[PDB]
Write a structure and sequence with these properties.
This is part of a larger assembly, with 3 copies of chain A, 1 copy of chain C, 2 copies of chain D and 1 copy of chain E. By secondary structure, chain C is of the alpha/beta class. Chain C has helices at about 1-20, 30, 35-40, 75-90, 110-115, 145-155, 170-175; strands at about 55, 65-70, 95-100, 120-125, 140-145, 165, 185-190, 190-195. The longest helix of chain C has 21 residues, at about 1-20. By secondary structure, chain D is α+β, with helices and mostly antiparallel strands. Classes of the chains: A mainly alpha, C alpha/beta, D alpha+beta, E alpha+beta. Chains F and G meet through strand 1, helix 3, strand 4, strand 5 and strand 12 of F and helix 1, helix 2, helix 3, strand 5 and strand 7 of G. The complex binds magnesium ion and zinc ion. The structure holds a DNA duplex. Chain A: This is DNA-directed RNA polymerases IV and V subunit 2.
Chain lengths: ~240, ~120, ~200, ~190, ~80, ~750, ~230
DNA sequence: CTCTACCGATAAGCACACGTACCTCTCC
DNA sequence: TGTGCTTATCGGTAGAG
């Protein structure tokens, strides 16, 4: 759920060229005030009480006014009834690979699954907008990657299962492609290839090419290493490294 | 910690903020920052010392071990709470700081030939 | 129009200094005239027309040079053809035009087309505000004649292309009106050197 | 109108006054001077020709000593032999900044070798190929050994040029002598 | 023969290298040797005594040359 | 079969047509299922080559074989040229299409294959069968031809640089080097185990012996004096080589595990010219600056300083006659008949011992150190340096200007005699040199002086930080209301110094000149027998800035990189636990994004550092150990050598290029008296003197406004890029008539 | 490797084991090695009550200089760790006191006999006919571009012809005289017979480039003199 | 009054280097 | 990882009937 603050490229008549608040949810860029009104909010007053700013700036209020204008121009009478949910459904359904579930249920298991109510995830959306506006107004520092507060390390509980899963996804694809040829004119220990995981794990341990965490190809190098056996201090500091 | 009671937390030791190869170096905050980085990283992995207490189940490409390994005379807290004698790989020699006929120029070393054939630094 | 006159006085002074350095017999009354001798002694409503003069060389009065000041910027085919016909009817060879803005591309081909007799060197008004030769960085550039070029090529026994090279785009080759194939003598503040216009 | 200047011109970034002891372009016979930083002109006009239009204040600035600090703009305004002196004055200040002492005759050779064709060419393959294209001396093997062998050999074969083997690499790659200390004399004549 | 009047070190190191290769290939020395077996020690004495029949074809960058002699040149 | 021997003169580059493509191939094959590895293959599984006689992959040249196709096709190097005659059988403009472009090489009906010695084959063994698809046959030809090693995806320049430019050779060796001061300067110590196995060519093969010259080298070749021809001296050691520590300055290395590989010449024509142009007797003048190449080391420099500045440690007759055994010249008069009423023997001063190295006809005068040498006798000297070090008027340069025939044994005798004298004296570093005081009260007064000098330097920086355009109403002589509230801001000034780049740049220079009086406390408290002060005044190793960090205080610690944290100006335990500190992040004074680290360490390397002070020192010293941006002095030296290696000096007196004998300079500069440079490659030694300054330069920036001295040399040398960044910095001056008024220049500017 | 009789000996007869230069200390800036030596000396010398002795060397809680010098003074030695020694070669006393003390040194894995790469005549490369780069074999030393560039400035072209053509990969190429193609003994297919064929001496890199330019579709014309 | 040809910004597509020496271990 | 070189696209300009 990526919420950006950039200029209005969509529907730009070369005059209204100020910043606007748009989101990136399920590969569909909708304005944030349509997503506010689609979940519980029925007025602009309680939509501004959720985004508690408590400041005096001209780049925040003008951006909020531009977001309200781009929400009222892209959808007619979106602040009355349920016209925002139709636009949300049509924006997700126009994607290249849309989910087969209904859009009234996609906002309950994809948009903030850690929360239960449909009105609480609108308050969390308002809190997320409030943090972005406070970071844009200079009252909040951005997250730096050099600090260990925003960093988590993975030794074997996430590095090994993410290589187990990319081999299980191949073992589950080499099973249906061999059971489809023997179904339309057998034990269960014939289609499940047991060596396709072992030959993948041995190759990943030998070559060092581990699976990328945000990709499928382009395997990274520098995850596993050999131990030094010249003195017990080298093998002690080799088990005490973080890259 | 003793005089001001305004902390509500305390550390065990200040030398435990370093690695296992850096907290065993004596006078580590007295040396230059570029010179301790050599000893704690490169010189600790190349120092020939203990190898194994069982060289019969080990068939590694190359293994080296001194005949008479020695623990140092000083006692760091890491080597005192770790109880590991293999953290130091070398022998302590009587080191003098003097010129010897210009044979120690440009970071050279003049060593005793009679002591090296008695068991010192033999691997 | 006072700023335009203060610009044009520096333009005329730099032009007279350049023509004196080239050796075209500029009189002493035109070299040391002040702003008062440029405004009160000359005309007031000039409109870039009273600066058109004709200068002949000191050694020979047959080689003339007509300085042309255009009435407007972005000059085209018609006025350049009129200037070419005026230069051809008076049997002159070299002309110098001091334009204000950049030329049109259709008028930049008539100079290369009619180039056997007429040699019209184009000068911008921004380049003639500060004299180039009167600088501490620029050394003494002495133009060598053919009789000196022959014994220079016969001294070192070198060819015409085995020399350090300058281009016609450089302002030093345009300050003296140097064509391709000439050798310039440069004295550095002795250690002398020679260049070749390419 | 909020991004429009009320003082000065639009294309000047910042002007600071500096004190110097060994300045470039010295006088006839320590001084204060200004360092003007101008914006990049997107049009065809030069930055110096826009700095000259200094029309209310023309006599307060010594125009017989002012020069741009860039070499490529100095040779475009005052000529190649006037930017050559700035190149020597910059090289003698950049060598001495590294704590080394060099002779001036080694810098006066690089300055006269990088300015043979009328302008200071680049140190890359294009600047070395332009010096051979201006002087009309083809050398495909040295340009092939410099940056790219295939891209230079294809253009050499498509044009039908001939290498005369005049350089040092061209002699040392086919079993010859370069011809500086050994190769410019012959003692075989008895 | 009006170029430098002095023998350079680059031509001297080639003349001595040619004379050492000649003497090493069993050639009669033009100078009288008195108790010496190294060819370089005979070559330096032949160069310092001006008794060697070599000629230097000093090439010019224009295309011509100037044929010199070893006895005409001087060694410092 | 005996063909004559000629000489290659010129090579022409042309595109091969179909006429020579079949005439150059021998026994061309046409079958699809046939490799035909019998007439064009060296590693083929046969007994001999059918083209060659008895081949053993040594006397057989790789033959070619053509693969003739059915139909002709357009040459793939001309598809970018046939799109110019058409807008997207042109006999009207046919004359321009065959004069400069080759018309006979336009039709392609055959394509040869590589021999088996150069291998690749899985595509050329697939397009050998004649089939259809005319528009896609060129799509296989252009991919079969793009498998060459001249292209890229040992490919491209890596093929050229390591086959034609960089080659390996025989009769070489490479051993780790150590120090041996007993050898001569022109001698290298070759062990008897490697020299017995190293064979040379003498008119048959014989082993290496004494007297043979060998060309040594230390990688990388930093300049032209890194190749010294030395004579072989056989030593009874093994697996190690050795030379004098004096010759480490041409090699630019140390005895550190640093290897040094040598090249043994085989022919006598390369052996004669090796000790005539390349040896140490010929490389006496440093070509970069005209001074001497070799100088004193560190032990010899310290022992030459200490024998001259003491003047109270007198030697007797038995010590002088022992030290004279290494000196080349005779004994002077003793000059001390009786120094005491109980003195029963004549004594010898220290400056008479150093005077035994000078020739009797040697005169030397240094006015900065009051050094007067007359008739080979050091007469006067009083508290000076740089006359024994490398300089413009040192005694080694004057000795080289005096005779230049017997200086290599004078430096060797000096290195022997000074090492004997320093062994008779004894140089050591103890804890009293680190303490820098005599007792405890002197150390307490020294610490109390350092703690006030740093507090005064902080006030100097806080005063200098007010010189901006915002405090112009306060700096003027008027009545200010905040004159007592602007001075007490001790933490706000440190916060404002780190957030901006110019206020830190004007404060580093304001700390570095106020620290010159703090560094001047090592001469008051330190004694004259301090080893660090001796090694700093001698100039052998170290300076006073290392002694201040050793004894009193480290001082200013700053980095030239913009980080995301600052320093809390105290470096204590309470400064680390402060939530409104610049060390944590945005202090809230509205948030902060970047900092320029600025911190002063009150402790030293002797009393021990705090963990926060050690973290500050580690942050400020991490930039000195990165091993990055090291391609700049390599590629700059390479691109400077490609531009300069062909320039030489002609016999006519001009400076010519090699490409067509083109003129570069007409005469050489008149700064040198030696005008016999008529056969030397001046451009090569002119580029080597710049590359040697390029490798030995600081690769770290000083601040955020300035740059490194290496990048400043790179931007000056690579200045012909004719585009970039649109900066165009100018520099205007002032007129002469502005000085007629009171403060006229300031008002005009 | 000095003998035991030549070292500067202490008055107790204790000769040093490893002698290092004093010049390495101000440049590298390493204090604490002398402190470790003065601590380990005061530990090992006997006191003429061994309890409550400064034995710890914890880095961020090191004892001061007054705690080490007093411990070294209680043992019966100097405070600064320096001792008066006598010259082992002559017997005479030295004017300065030499710092001594036990210091924990290490032996690295980089020995000199594992770096020897001498070669007279060995195996060649299968492709470029260059010497190999293996120390287990005879090997060879790469005469790089910098060693050629610094030999160009010295004017030494006799070793430059030997180390690049003679001692490196040398080969032979035959060039037709009337024709202008590479003739493969030698026989020109374009010419009527092999009556005018000359042989030039080029390195193997030139032939490896010629057979590659012919592989990429570029022929070469060779103009010879003799 | 309109019709047609030529030039200087503005993105778009593609080859460019990562030092110079050497020195092993582990898999292809 | 970005810097440099070449080429297609587009707006503004000027001569001619
Ligand atoms: Mg070293
Ligand atoms: Zn064959």
């Amino acid at each position: 759920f990526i919420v950006r603050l950039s200029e209005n490229e969509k529907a730009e008549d070369y005059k209204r060229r100020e910043k606007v608040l748009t989101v990136y949810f399920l590969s569909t860029e909708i304005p944030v005030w349509l997503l506010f009104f689609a979940l519980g909010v029925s007025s602009d007053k309680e939509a501004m009480d959720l985004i508690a700013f408590d400041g005096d700036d001209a780049s925040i209020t003008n951006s909020l006014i531009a977001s309200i204008h781009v929400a009222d121009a892209v959808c007619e009478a979106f602040r009355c009834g349920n016209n925002a949910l139709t636009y949300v459904e049509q924006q997700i359904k126009s994607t290249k690979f849309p989910p087969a579930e209904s859009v009234d249920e996609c906002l309950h298991l994809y948009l903030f699954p850690g929360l239960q109510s449909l009105k609480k995830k609108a308050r969390f959306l308002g809190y997320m907008v409030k943090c972005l506006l406070n970071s844009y107004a200079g009252k909040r520092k951005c997250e730096n990657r050099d600090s260990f507060r925003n960093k988590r390390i993975e030794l074997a509980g996430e590095l090994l299962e993410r290589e187990i899963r990319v081999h299980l996804a191949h073992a589950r694809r080499k099973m249906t492609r061999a059971m489809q040829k023997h179904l339309s004119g057998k034990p269960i220990e014939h289609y499940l290839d047991a060596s396709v995981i072992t030959n993948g794990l041995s190759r990943a341990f030998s070559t060092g090419a581990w699976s990328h965490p945000f990709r499928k190809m382009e395997r990274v190098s520098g995850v596993v290493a050999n131990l030094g056996r010249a003195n017990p201090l080298q093998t002690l500091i080799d088990l005490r490294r973080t890259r | 910690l003793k005089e001001p009671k305004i902390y509500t937390h305390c550390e065990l030791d200040l030398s435990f903020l370093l690695g296992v190869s850096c907290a065993v170096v004596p006078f580590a905050n007295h040396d230059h920052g570029r010179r301790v980085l050599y000893q704690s990283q490169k010189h600790c992995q190349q120092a020939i010392g203990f190898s194994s207490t069982n060289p019969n189940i080990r068939c590694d490409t190359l293994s080296q071990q001194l005949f008479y390994p020695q623990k140092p005379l000083f006692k760091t807290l890491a080597s005192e709470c770790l109880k590991k004698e293999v953290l130091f790989n070398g022998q302590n020699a009587i080191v003098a700081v003097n010129v010897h006929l210009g044979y120690n120029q440009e970071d050279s070393i003049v060593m005793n030939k009679a002591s090296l054939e008695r068991g010192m630094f033999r691997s | 129009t006072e700023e335009e006159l203060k610009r044009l006085y520096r333009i005329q002074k730099t032009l007279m200094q350049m023509l004196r350095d080239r050796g075209y017999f500029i009189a002493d009354s035109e070299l040391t005239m002040t702003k008062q001798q440029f405004i009160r002694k000359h005309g007031d409503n000039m409109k870039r027309e009273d600066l058109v003069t004709l200068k002949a060389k000191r050694n020979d009065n047959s080689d003339q040079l007509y300085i042309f000041f255009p009435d407007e910027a972005k000059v085209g085919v018609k006025t350049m053809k009129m200037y070419t016909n005026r230069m051809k009817s008076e049997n002159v060879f070299r002309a110098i035009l001091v334009v204000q803005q950049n030329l049109t591309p259709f008028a930049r081909t008539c100079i290369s087309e009619i180039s056997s007799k007429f040699h019209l060197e184009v000068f911008q008004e921004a380049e003639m505000l500060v004299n180039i030769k009167e600088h501490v960085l620029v050394p003494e550039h002495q133009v060598l004649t053919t009789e000196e070029k022959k014994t220079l090529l016969e001294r070192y026994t070198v060819k015409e292309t085995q020399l350090p090279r300058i281009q016609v785009t450089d302002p030093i080759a345009r300050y003296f009106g140097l064509k391709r194939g000439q050798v310039v003598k440069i004295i550095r503040p002795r250690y002398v050197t020679y260049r070749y216009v390419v | 109108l909020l991004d429009s200047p009320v003082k000065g011109d639009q294309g000047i970034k910042k002007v600071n006054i500096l004190w110097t002891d060994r300045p470039k372009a010295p006088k006839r016979n320590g001084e204060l001077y200004l360092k003007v930083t101008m914006y990049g002109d997107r049009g065809k006009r030069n930055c110096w020709t826009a700095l000259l239009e200094c029309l209310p204040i023309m006599d307060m600035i010594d125009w017989g000593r002012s020069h741009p600090d860039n070499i490529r703009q100095c040779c475009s305004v005052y000529g190649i032999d006037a930017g050559r002196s700035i190149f020597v004055a910059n090289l003698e200040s950049a060598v001495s900044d590294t704590g080394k002492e060099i002779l001036r005759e080694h810098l006066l050779l690089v300055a006269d070798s990088l300015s043979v064709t009328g302008e200071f060419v680049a140190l890359n393959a294009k600047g070395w190929s332009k010096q051979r294209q201006v002087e009309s001396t083809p050398a495909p093997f040295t340009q092939a050994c410099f940056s790219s062998p295939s891209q230079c050999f294809l253009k050499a074969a498509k044009e039908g040029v001939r290498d005369d083997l005049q350089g040092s690499i061209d002699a040392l790659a086919w079993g010859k002598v370069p011809g500086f200390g050994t190769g410019d004399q012959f003692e075989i004549i008895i | 023969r009006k170029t430098s009047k002095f023998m350079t070190k680059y031509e001297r190191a080639r003349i001595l290298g040619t004379r050492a290769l000649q003497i090493s290939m069993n050639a009669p020395v033009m100078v009288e040797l008195e108790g010496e077996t190294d060819p370089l020690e005979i070559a330096m004495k032949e160069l310092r005594q001006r008794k060697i029949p070599f000629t230097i074809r000093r090439y010019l960058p224009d295309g011509s040359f100037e044929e010199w002699g070893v006895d005409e040149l001087i060694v410092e | 079969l005996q063909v004559p021997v000629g000489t290659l003169t010129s090579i022409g580059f042309s595109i091969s047509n179909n006429n020579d493509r079949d005439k150059m191939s021998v026994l061309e094959v046409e079958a699809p299922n046939q490799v035909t590895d019998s007439r064009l293959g060296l590693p083929n599984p046969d007994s001999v080559c059918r083209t060659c006689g008895s081949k053993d992959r040594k006397v057989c040249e790789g033959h070619f074989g053509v693969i003739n196709f059915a139909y002709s096709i357009i040459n793939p190097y001309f598809l970018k040229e046939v799109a110019a005659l058409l807008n997207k059988l042109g006999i009207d403009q046919r004359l321009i299409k065959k004069d400069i472009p080759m018309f006979n090489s336009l039709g392609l009906t055959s394509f040869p294959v590589t021999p088996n010695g150069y291998r690749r084959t899985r595509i050329y063994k697939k397009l050998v069968g004649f089939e259809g698809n005319t528009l896609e046959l060129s799509s296989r030809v252009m991919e079969c031809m793009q498998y060459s090693r001249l292209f890229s995806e040992l490919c491209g320049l890596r093929f050229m640089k390591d086959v034609l430019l960089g080659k390996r050779s025989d009769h070489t060796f490479r051993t780790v080097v150590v120090g041996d001061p007993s050898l001569k300067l022109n001698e290298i110590g070759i062990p008897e185990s490697i020299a017995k196995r190293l064979q040379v060519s003498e008119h048959i093969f014989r082993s290496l012996m004494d007297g043979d010259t060998v060309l040594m080298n230390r990688p990388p070749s930093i300049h032209q004096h890194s190749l010294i021809a030395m004579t072989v001296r056989i030593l009874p050691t093994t697996s190690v080589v050795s030379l004098n520590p004096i010759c480490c300055l041409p090699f630019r290395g140390d005895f550190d595990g640093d290897c040094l590989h040598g090249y043994v010449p085989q022919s006598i024509q390369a052996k004669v010219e090796l000790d005539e142009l390349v040896a140490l007797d010929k490389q006496l003048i440093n070509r970069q600056n005209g001074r001497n190449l070799l100088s004193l080391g560190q032990d010899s420099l310290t022992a030459a300083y200490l024998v001259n500045v003491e003047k109270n440690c007198y030697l007797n007759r038995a010590q002088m006659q022992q030290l004279q055994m290494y000196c080349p010249f005779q004994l002077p008069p003793p000059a001390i008949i009786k120094a005491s009423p109980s003195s029963t023997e004549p004594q010898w001063t220290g400056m008479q011992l150093f005077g035994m190295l000078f020739p009797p006809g040697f005169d030397y005068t240094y006015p900065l150190n009051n050094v007067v040498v007359s008739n080979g006798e050091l007469l006067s000297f009083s508290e000076g340096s740089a006359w024994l070090r490398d300089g413009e008027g040192n005694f080694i340069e004057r000795l080289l200007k005096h005779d230049k025939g017997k200086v290599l044994d004078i430096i060797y005798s000096a290195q022997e005699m000074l090492s004997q004298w320093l062994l008779m004296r004894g140089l050591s570093v103890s804890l009293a040199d680190l303490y820098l005081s005599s007792d405890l009260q002197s150390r307490k007064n020294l610490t109390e002086e350092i703690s006030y000098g740093l507090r005064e330097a902080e006030q100097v920086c806080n005063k200098q930080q007010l010189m901006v355009e915002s405090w112009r109403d306060f700096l003027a002589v008027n009545g200010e209301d905040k004159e007592e509230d602007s001075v007490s801001d001790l933490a706000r000034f440190c916060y404002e110094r780190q957030k901006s780049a110019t206020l830190s740049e004007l404060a580093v220079s304001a700390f570095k000149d106020a620290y010159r009086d703090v560094q001047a406390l090592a001469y008051r408290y330190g004694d004259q027998s301090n080893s660090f002060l001796i090694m700093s005044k001698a100039g052998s190793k170290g300076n006073i800035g290392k002694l201040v960090q050793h004894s009193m205080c480290i001082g200013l610690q700053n980095s030239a990189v913009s980080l995301s944290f600052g320093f809390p100006r105290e470096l204590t335990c309470a400064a680390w636990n402060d939530p409104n500190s610049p060390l944590r992040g945005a202090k809230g004074k509205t948030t902060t994004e970047s900092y320029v680290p600025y911190g002063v360490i009150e402790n030293s390397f002797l009393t021990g550092l705090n963990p926060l002070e050690s973290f500050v020192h580690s942050v400020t010293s991490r930039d000195s150990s990165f091993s990055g941006n090291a391609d700049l002095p390599g590629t700059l030296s390479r691109r400077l050598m490609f531009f300069m290696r062909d320039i030489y000096a002609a016999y006519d007196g001009t400076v010519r290029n090699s490409f067509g004998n083109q003129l570069v300079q007409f005469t050489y500069e008149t700064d040198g008296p030696v005008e016999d440079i008529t056969g030397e490659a001046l451009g090569s030694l002119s580029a080597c003197a710049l590359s040697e300054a390029a490798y030995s330069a600081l690769d770290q920036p000083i601040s955020l406004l300035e740059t490194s001295p290496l990048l400043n040399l790179k931007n000056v040398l690579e200045c012909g890029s004719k585009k970039g960044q649109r900066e165009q910095t100018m520099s205007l001056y002032l007129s002469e008539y502005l000085s007629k008024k009171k403060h006229g220049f300031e008002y005009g500017s | 490797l000095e003998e035991q009789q030549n070292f500067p000996f202490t008055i107790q007869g204790i000769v040093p084991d490893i002698v290092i230069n004093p010049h390495a200390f101000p440049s590298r800036q390493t204090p604490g090695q002398l402190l470790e030596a003065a601590l380990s000396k005061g530990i090992a010398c006997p006191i003429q009550a061994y309890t409550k002795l400064t034995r710890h060397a914890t880095p961020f809680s090191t004892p001061g200089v007054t705690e080490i010098t007093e411990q070294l003074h209680r043992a019966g030695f100097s405070r600064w760790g320096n001792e008066r020694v006598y010259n082992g070669r002559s017997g005479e006393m030295m004017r300065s006191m030499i710092f001594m003390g036990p210091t924990f040194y290490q032996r690295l894995v980089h020995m000199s006999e594992d770096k020897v790469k001498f070669r007279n005549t060995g195996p060649v490369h299968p492709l470029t006919r260059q010497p190999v780069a293996d120390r287990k074999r005879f090997g060879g030393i790469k005469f790089g571009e910098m060693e050629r560039d610094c030999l160009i400035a010295h004017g030494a072209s006799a070793n430059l012809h030997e180390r690049l053509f003679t001692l490196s990969d040398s080969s032979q190429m035959h060039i037709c005289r009337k024709c202008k193609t590479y003739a493969n003994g030698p026989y020109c297919r374009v010419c009527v017979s092999s009556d005018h064929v000359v042989r030039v001496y080029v390195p193997y890199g030139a032939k490896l480039l010629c057979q590659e330019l012919f592989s990429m579709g570029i022929t070469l014309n060779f103009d010879t003199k003799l």
